[PDB]
């Protein structure tokens, strides 16, 4: 696949990581794709990539940094995206990492 078009659906606060990502992988054969993303600024949600062939393979991604930039390693390449991780509502909770 190529064309690493990341559709970061929500840039959360946030909590346990969760948040929106979707690599629009221009691929001919979906399957097991490399998921774990090359940037420690926001913690990734999932580990492998269910690759929709030519599809927006969705993914979780959680970063608490309000000026977020998510640079993933979507198996056949990197993937660039940046969304504002808009801060959440509550104050104290189970966990988060980003």
């Amino acid at each position: 696949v190529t064309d690493l078009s990341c559709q970061v659906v929500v840039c959360t606060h946030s909590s346990d990581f969760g948040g929106v990502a979707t690599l629009s992988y221009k691929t001919d054969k979906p399957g097991k794709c490399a998921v774990h993303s090359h940037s420690n600024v926001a913690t990734l949600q999932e580990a492998t990539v269910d690759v929709k062939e030519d599809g927006k393979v969705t993914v979780h991604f959680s970063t608490a940094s309000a000026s977020p930039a998510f640079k993933v390693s979507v198996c056949d390449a990197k993937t660039t995206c940046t969304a504002a991780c808009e801060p959440p509502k509550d104050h104290i909770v189970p966990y988060g990492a980003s």
Binding site: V10, T12, V20
Partner: protein
């Protein structure tokens, strides 16, 4: 006993007897604070595309 209390009512209120109704008036607004539930909004990827 001339013109009515609600009947000569200004402020557009519906005036009326013992539970002394002056209601639906043309007076005032409605302030409100709505503690919205989690279930009121849909999901983040829960929406249609």
């Amino acid at each position: 006993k001339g013109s009515s209390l609600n009947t000569k009512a200004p402020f557009g209120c519906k005036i009326k007897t013992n539970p002394v109704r002056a209601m639906d008036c043309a007076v005032g607004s409605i302030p409100v604070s709505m503690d919205i539930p989690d279930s009121a909004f849909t999901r983040v990827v829960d929406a249609p595309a």
